[PDB]
Write a protein that binds this ligand. Structure first.
Ligand SMILES: [Mn+2]
Ligand SMILES: [Mn+2]
Lengths: 240, 240
DNA sequence: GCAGTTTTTTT
DNA sequence: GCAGTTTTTTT
């Protein structure tokens, strides 16, 4: 499956090199298809390969629209590589094949929206930090969640990235870089004396040694980098 | 191409036999896909085979919605027969392949909506007539135009079917049965003394010997069967 | 894994 | 042919 994921990243990056820019309107430049924003209710997107139409839901937030669009573009890239398609047919089936294809298109979509070049630029400017996470979401015009998964994958040291927001600050989303085994489950509570909540209240960014507030009550030592945004904090728990 | 058209009729009829009925909501019963009616602006329909979604425009008239739906269903039937698909790949290309596929799906769609059984039932009850045309559109829940093309194809004698409506009664749509070479171009004018206009004005159906009012001014003898509806007349010009 | 959205894990 | 929608043909 990782082979397929690699090949999907290849196609998507080749696609995104050919694009003039990553603005929402330049993304469809390398595809013989038309794009229509309209109200789609619950559905976020659709790609009709036979009539060459991409439909994106106009009622959802821009960052979602952008990820759905790159998802749908990756659907096209996949239908165009009969080799990758052939391998998947010889390796999966039925419902399993469906999930594999959907995951690959999510992979390809992040590969279009967030080039390794941008992630490494921020990594060198800001380190594997809450600040880098915040900057990635803004500079790539993606949601904090998509940026977190992308930033974490490219982080070569032990770090547990998280997105927190009142819901009562709680972990809304989180991922660890390749080596990490620990998991900060969504809804894990943020103590009010913890720098992440201090960041949100003070509205200032905080770098300092603190702890991961796992639900088990284990306070695992970590160095926290928290960047406060509007009712949300993007944080990096660096582990030793 | 006719081979492909035949094979498309095979799949569609096999599909429609399995259906409980031809009501708009039973048509999607034999397909692992979901159907969503929503406002689609200019577009009439879309089929996403990867997410298994059929989208039909809610703003267009029911008869159109019904034809678009059977069109989209025929798209699915085609993606499922790799043999028919293979032949088309070995026979057409690029834009030509696109039109071929679209025509076949229109073929399959009429085959779903209008079974030979229904057409022959009306042919035996009403003859190759304007009345048969009218009854076909109502009993199949299709537009007069789609019924005309279907009825004409199954008419074994020389007849030029037409749909006329004020636009000034003019030929809005027309087709001739297999043998006919003449063409009653859309916009051909209906003289006000001609029984078709008499039918519309009297609101009574007329069977009588008359003539085809070709634009060339040639009044070719024909036996007319005209059934008056709401601001429209479905007529059969039987030729010798 | 896969999430794509505001020694510290835990079917 | 392909339209799928209210001797009489005519790039
Ligand atoms: Mn998808
Ligand atoms: Mn089509």
């Amino acid at each position: 499956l990782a082979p397929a994921k690699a090949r999907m990243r290849e196609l998507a990056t080749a696609y995104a090199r050919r694009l003039p820019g990553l603005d929402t309107h330049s993304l469809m430049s390398g595809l013989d298809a038309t794009l229509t924003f309209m109200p789609m209710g619950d559905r976020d997107g659709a790609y009709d390969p036979e009539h060459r139409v991409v439909l994106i839901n106009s009622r959802v937030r821009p960052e979602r629209q952008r990820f759905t669009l790159a998802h749908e573009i990756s659907h096209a890239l996949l239908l165009g590589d009969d080799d990758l398609l052939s391998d998947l047919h010889d390796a999966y089936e039925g419902e399993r094949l469906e999930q594999v294809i959907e995951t690959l298109c999510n992979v390809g979509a992040a590969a279009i929206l967030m080039p390794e070049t941008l992630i490494d630029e921020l990594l060198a400017r800001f380190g594997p930090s809450g600040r880098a996470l915040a900057e990635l979401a803004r500079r790539a015009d993606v949601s904090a969640s998509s940026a977190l998964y992308a930033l974490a994958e490219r982080t070569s040291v032990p770090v547990l990235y998280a997105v927190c927001a009142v819901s009562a600050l709680t972990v809304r989303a989180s991922a660890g870089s390749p080596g990490v085994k620990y998991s900060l489950r969504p809804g894990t509570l943020i103590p009010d004396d913890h720098p992440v909540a201090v960041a949100l209240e003070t509205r200032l960014p905080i770098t300092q040694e603190s702890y991961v507030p796992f639900r088990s009550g284990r306070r695992m030592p970590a160095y926290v980098d928290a960047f406060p945004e509007r009712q949300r904090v993007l944080v990096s728990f660096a582990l030793l």
